[PDB]
Amino acid sequence: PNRFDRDRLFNAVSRGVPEDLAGLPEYLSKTSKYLTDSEYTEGSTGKTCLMKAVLNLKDGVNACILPLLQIDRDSGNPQPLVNAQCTDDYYRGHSALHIAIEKRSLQCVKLLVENGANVHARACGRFFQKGGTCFYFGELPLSLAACTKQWDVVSYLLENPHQPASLQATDSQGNTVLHALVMISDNSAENIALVTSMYDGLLQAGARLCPTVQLEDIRNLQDLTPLKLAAKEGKIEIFRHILQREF
């Protein structure tokens, strides 16, 4: 009666009703199964029940998330559910933490990070890379938080007691959050203020958190600093920022 196949599991986290998970711990214990087992993940992408739960936040909330994390912890999973990543070429590296940030749920971000979610995991699949259409934010959780203009989430990622995210982290192409901000910037008057606001906030954070490191001098794998990247990519407004910032 307590048997959970993937359908039951996924359906039982999609509606956000934790009582629908009744019997799951006992079943996993009996069968020596884990929530990260191939039978419990989407075959095409490696999508897990935790990712499903986070994708199904309503009003920032899915009451199934913590129970899943607790079940996984209690099971003693050697490969924690929290850090599972997509395995397909398109969504490669996508994690529950990335989803939580995209959903703009600081509460979910905190829950995941508290439970060990890897703040330097890279969403590096084709969907997440330049260069037709893509959903680019420089692959990293911090960079996603910055590119989506979430200072509260950026702040938490940088300062939390579990795994602080590094301002110096780079994506698969050596792009830091500053490079990512250059990339997502445009030359529109209506959009630049928000971008330059996080940019400046991050530089200020750098002065606090890595004072000896000149973040603007970090070069990506194409040997470009954020300023030189801006110039290359025709990001005139941020290029002008970045130059005139200290005035």
Side-chain angles (χ1 to χ4, degrees):
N2 282 356
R3 181 175 123 89
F4 274 75
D5 61 358
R6 191 225 278 127
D7 285 350
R8 189 178 175 183
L9 174 67
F10 273 52
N11 293 333
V13 307
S14 290
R15 310 188 247 79
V17 177
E19 291 84 14
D20 291 324
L21 295 171
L24 178 65
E26 297 78 10
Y27 178 74
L28 294 180
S29 179
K30 190 188 70 164
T31 59
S32 295
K33 295 183 177 184
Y34 300 94
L35 298 173
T36 50
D37 284 355
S38 60
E39 80 188 83
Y40 286 127
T41 66
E42 244 76 304
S44 55
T45 61
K47 177 180 300 309
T48 67
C49 59
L50 181 61
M51 291 173 191
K52 187 78 172 175
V54 182
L55 285 155
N56 285 278
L57 291 171
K58 169 205 260 236
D59 284 329
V61 162
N62 183 333
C64 291
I65 297 162
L66 189 43
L68 283 183
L69 291 164
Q70 287 171 343
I71 289 165
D72 194 61
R73 170 93 91 238
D74 295 343
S75 78
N77 192 346
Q79 292 184 300
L81 175 65
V82 70
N83 284 145
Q85 286 173 283
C86 291
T87 52
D88 66 295
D89 286 349
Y90 197 59
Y91 295 125
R92 182 167 281 122
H94 203 36
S95 77
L97 180 59
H98 288 99
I99 301 172
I101 296 162
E102 192 180 352
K103 295 287 286 186
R104 312 182 78 79
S105 179
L106 176 55
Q107 38 175 309
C108 198
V109 170
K110 293 172 71 279
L111 228 207
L112 293 168
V113 169
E114 287 166 4
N115 282 274
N118 160 181
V119 301
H120 296 130
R122 296 167 173 177
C124 58
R126 286 188 246 82
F127 177 66
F128 296 113
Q129 307 162 3
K130 318 110 96 208
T133 91
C134 56
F135 186 66
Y136 180 76
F137 51 82
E139 303 183 1
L140 294 156
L142 179 63
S143 297
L144 178 58
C147 288
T148 58
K149 322 303 186 308
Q150 299 186 71
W151 188 255
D152 62 344
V153 176
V154 168
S155 179
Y156 177 75
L157 289 173
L158 292 168
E159 307 274 343
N160 75 266
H162 321 286
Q163 189 193 190
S166 174
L167 288 158
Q168 302 178 253
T170 81
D171 71 4
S172 304
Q173 303 307 117
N175 294 300
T176 67
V177 59
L178 302 186
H179 293 94
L181 285 172
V182 165
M183 292 301 304
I184 68 111
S185 74
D186 66 18
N187 299 143
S188 297
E190 66 263 24
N191 305 329
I192 196 62
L194 252 62
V195 175
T196 62
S197 190
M198 223 101 291
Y199 201 96
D200 289 345
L202 294 163
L203 292 182
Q204 286 300 329
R208 278 192 54 242
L209 301 172
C210 48
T212 69
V213 177
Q214 287 268 19
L215 293 172
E216 301 186 285
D217 292 346
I218 303 173
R219 289 166 187 252
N220 64 11
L221 291 177
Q222 289 195 328
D223 204 37
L224 268 23
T225 60
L227 181 66
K228 270 57 179 182
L229 182 63
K232 176 199 208 190
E233 295 292 19
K235 306 302 190 187
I236 304 159
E237 290 307 318
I238 205 177
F239 171 85
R240 290 179 183 167
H241 191 247
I242 258 177
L243 280 177
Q244 86 200 167
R245 196 191 33 104
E246 62 155 302
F247 314 79

